[PDB]
Amino acid sequence: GLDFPEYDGVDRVINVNAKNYKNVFKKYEVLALLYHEPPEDDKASQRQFEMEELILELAAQVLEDKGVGFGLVDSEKDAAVAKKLGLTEVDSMYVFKGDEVIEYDGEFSADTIVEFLLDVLEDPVELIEGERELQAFENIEDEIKLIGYFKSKDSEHYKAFEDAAEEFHPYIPFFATFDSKVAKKLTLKLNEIDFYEAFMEEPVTIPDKPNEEEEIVNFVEEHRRSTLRKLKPESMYETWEDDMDGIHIVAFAEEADPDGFEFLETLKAVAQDNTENPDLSIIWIDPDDFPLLVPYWEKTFDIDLSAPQIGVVNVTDADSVWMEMLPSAEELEDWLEDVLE
Amino acid sequence: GLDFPEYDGVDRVINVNAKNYKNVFKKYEVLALLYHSQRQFEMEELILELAAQVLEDKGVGFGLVDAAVAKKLGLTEVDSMYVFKGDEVIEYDGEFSADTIVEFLLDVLEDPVELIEGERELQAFENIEDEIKLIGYFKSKDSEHYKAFEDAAEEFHPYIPFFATFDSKVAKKLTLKLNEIDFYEAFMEEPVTIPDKPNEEEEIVNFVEEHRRSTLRKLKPESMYETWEDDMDGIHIVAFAEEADPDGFEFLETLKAVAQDNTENPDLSIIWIDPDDFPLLVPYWEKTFDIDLSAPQIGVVNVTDADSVWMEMDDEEDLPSAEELEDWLEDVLE
């Protein structure tokens, strides 16, 4: 009962053009489109393009029963209809669910793609009712999370909260509660929203505005970057473009390794003592989550990823300087504050 | 500085013959051989071709196996990957994907014994409960007791992590005497001491193989087939719970509570599956078992009949207690 799926050979990826795109959008509730460029006149890039379809074809086969369809849009022959749908970022995949146009910013792998669309398929807002369920919510700390207290799911405030949830779906989990006892523990007023920074226990309340739907969106985009961020294969490329003057403070730590877990607890403590400084934000990369990238990382950065590492990586030219080594919570902090320019 | 590897097109997988193996075993420190529908065959080499490109400079070579050396090398299973490192043959029992194959081989390259020095590292060691672990207190690698421990480590490498310490401060916290070895059951906090018996080495192996089944086990992609093939009755108690989801986190804590109070029953061994770790298998599980994996699930799977009996929880407030789950699993006899 562990049948790992193998490719059928059946063609399910659609060639979306200006003549059939209207009918394809009616076919599927959730539609994934690989917005691509035609391969250049060199079989070096052609070989690379067919594997992109091979990954999509497997994902189309695995998610066929979920009402998910996969398509291809060429930007030099179907550039017209590409603009009507909102396909702008080139060589990117876009997911369409109702009125949502979500750009995929993660691994172009069969596993991550299917996992990402499974997360697009779930509802943008999850409800918390029991205190036993609230305790579980508070122990999720590796990501940004928003929770609000509303009178009803038919309320105008919940629908404004749900609309903002679909804006960041499915990267940022949005939680809601109608239980007055749950809001008591969170110190949450009616229609008040709690924003939890990553790896933080104390949240912050989003200020109330007349257009609250837009307020949640701009507040999230203002606080999307935390002092400590975990690189995840689903949003890996989205986290990499959030550079700080062209550099990235990258720390490698294996969570399953006690030496890496020991350094991970240090990065957690450093995140607390430096919540005040936004210029200091560490991207924690667990190399156990990115096996295909550690030989490139070891070669480019000249480090051994079997041990905890931390340093500053240049986004442009991939240059890097790394701390020499386990460091204490304080020792790490000024090691960061003495490399500024 | 985040360039995902893209396939070269260069063939690095060697077609091994009965006049090839003696030197390709010498060219590479670690050798991974795929003991092999018409179309389905050559595309699973594409997964192998990406792994060979990624592990090009790690001393890892990939090969394809003709039946003459399958006799000598020990390749037995129908379509499986065998990994060679020194005097050991490791049979791969995980996802056949570029994700887990590269990750599995990086662990094979690791040393079989990891050392714990200092109390800060000891605390972090105790926060790892996803797998069975062993910790032994010796003096040095020169010790005769350490040699038996390290020898037992390579027979389970890299499935069972083996830990050691020469620091007396670390062993005092664990109350581990010299040459004493503690066996941590998965998701169990307090371990049991392996008895120090005349011949140490295989008593560690006999103890580990005897206790290879914990009350609660986590299905991991690199060892997915190792478990579910450590099978009794041909049946498996399968629990689905997303750790990143609060609703699944709550049911996970109920599963953890069961793993403490019920080591008495030999046949209460739940396999916790996190569907977030196996996206390619979610639609298959939802169709074979007829359950929605967005919510916690637990039930008995009978591979003999491909049958399944599930708990049928309406909503979150329908999730069972630590004792309701224990009772429900017991009354499923035949």
Swiss-Prot record, chain B:
UniProt-listed Gene3D superfamilies: Glutaredoxin (3.40.30.10)
Compartment annotation: Endoplasmic reticulum; Sarcoplasmic reticulum; Sarcoplasmic reticulum lumen; Sarcoplasmic reticulum membrane
Chief place of localization: endoplasmic reticulum
GO CC annotations on file: endoplasmic reticulum; mitochondrial matrix; mitochondrion; sarcoplasmic reticulum; sarcoplasmic reticulum lumen; sarcoplasmic reticulum membrane; smooth endoplasmic reticulum; T-tubule
Glycosylated residues, chain numbering: N302
Mutagenesis or variant effect for D8N: In TAM1; increased calcium-dependent susceptibility to proteolytic degradation; decreased calcium-dependent aggregation; decreased calcium-dependent polymerization; no effect on subcellular localization; no effect on the subcellular localization of STIM1; decreased calcium content of intracellular stores; loss of the ability to inhibit store-operated calcium entry (SOCE) activity
Alphabetical keyword list: Calcium, Disease variant, Endoplasmic reticulum, Glycoprotein, Membrane, Metal-binding, Mitochondrion, Muscle protein, Phosphoprotein, Sarcoplasmic reticulum, Signal
PTM annotation (Phosphothreonine): residues: T76
Modified residues (Phosphotyrosine): Y7
Any GO molecular function: identical protein binding
Tissue-by-tissue expression: Expressed in myoblasts (at protein level).
Topology in membrane: Peripheral membrane protein
Name of one Pfam family that matches: Calsequestrin
Record note on what altering D196G does: In VMCQA; no effect on calcium-dependent susceptibility to proteolytic degradation; increased calcium-dependent aggregation; causes impaired polymerization of the protein; no effect on subcellular localization; decreased calcium content of sarcoplasmic reticulum stores; reduced sarcoplasmic reticulum calcium release during excitation-contraction coupling
Coiled-coil residues: none
Gene Ontology terms: biological process: endoplasmic reticulum organization; positive regulation of release of sequestered calcium ion into cytosol; positive regulation of store-operated calcium channel activity; protein polymerization; regulation of skeletal muscle contraction by regulation of release of sequestered calcium ion; regulation of store-operated calcium entry; response to denervation involved in regulation of muscle adaptation; response to heat
Listed InterPro entries: Calsequestrin, Calsequestrin_C, Calsequestrin_CS, Calsequestrin_middle_dom, Calsequestrin_N, Thioredoxin-like_sf
Modified residues (Phosphoserine): S37, S168
Post-translational modification comment from the UniProt entry: N-glycosylated.
Metal-binding keyword on record: yes
PANTHER family (alphabetical): CALSEQUESTRIN, CALSEQUESTRIN-1
Disease implicated: Myopathy, vacuolar, with CASQ1 aggregates: An autosomal dominant mild muscle disorder characterized by adult onset of muscle cramping and weakness as well as increased levels of serum creatine kinase. The disorder is not progressive, and some patients may be asymptomatic. Myopathy, tubular aggregate, 1: A rare congenital myopathy characterized by regular arrays of membrane tubules on muscle biopsies without additional histopathological hallmarks. Tubular aggregates in muscle are structures of variable appearance consisting of an outer tubule containing either one or more microtubule-like structures or amorphous material. They may occur in a variety of circumstances, including inherited myopathies, alcohol- and drug-induced myopathies, exercise-induced cramps or muscle weakness.
Similarity-based family: Belongs to the calsequestrin family.
Complex and partners: Monomer; increases in response to a depletion of intracellular calcium. Homodimer. Homotetramer and homopolymer. Can form linear homooligomers. Ca(2+) ions promote oligomerization. Interacts (via C-terminal end and preferentially with the monomeric form) with STIM1; this interaction increases in response to a depletion of intracellular calcium, decreases both STIM1 aggregation and clustering, interaction of STIM1 with ORAI1 and store-operated Ca(2+) entry (SOCE) activity. Interacts with ASPH and TRDN.
Function (record text): Calsequestrin is a high-capacity, moderate affinity, calcium-binding protein and thus acts as an internal calcium store in muscle. Calcium ions are bound by clusters of acidic residues at the protein surface, often at the interface between subunits. Can bind around 80 Ca(2+) ions. Regulates the release of lumenal Ca(2+) via the calcium release channel RYR1; this plays an important role in triggering muscle contraction. Negatively regulates store-operated Ca(2+) entry (SOCE) activity.
Protein name: Calsequestrin-1
Organism for this UniProt entry: Homo sapiens
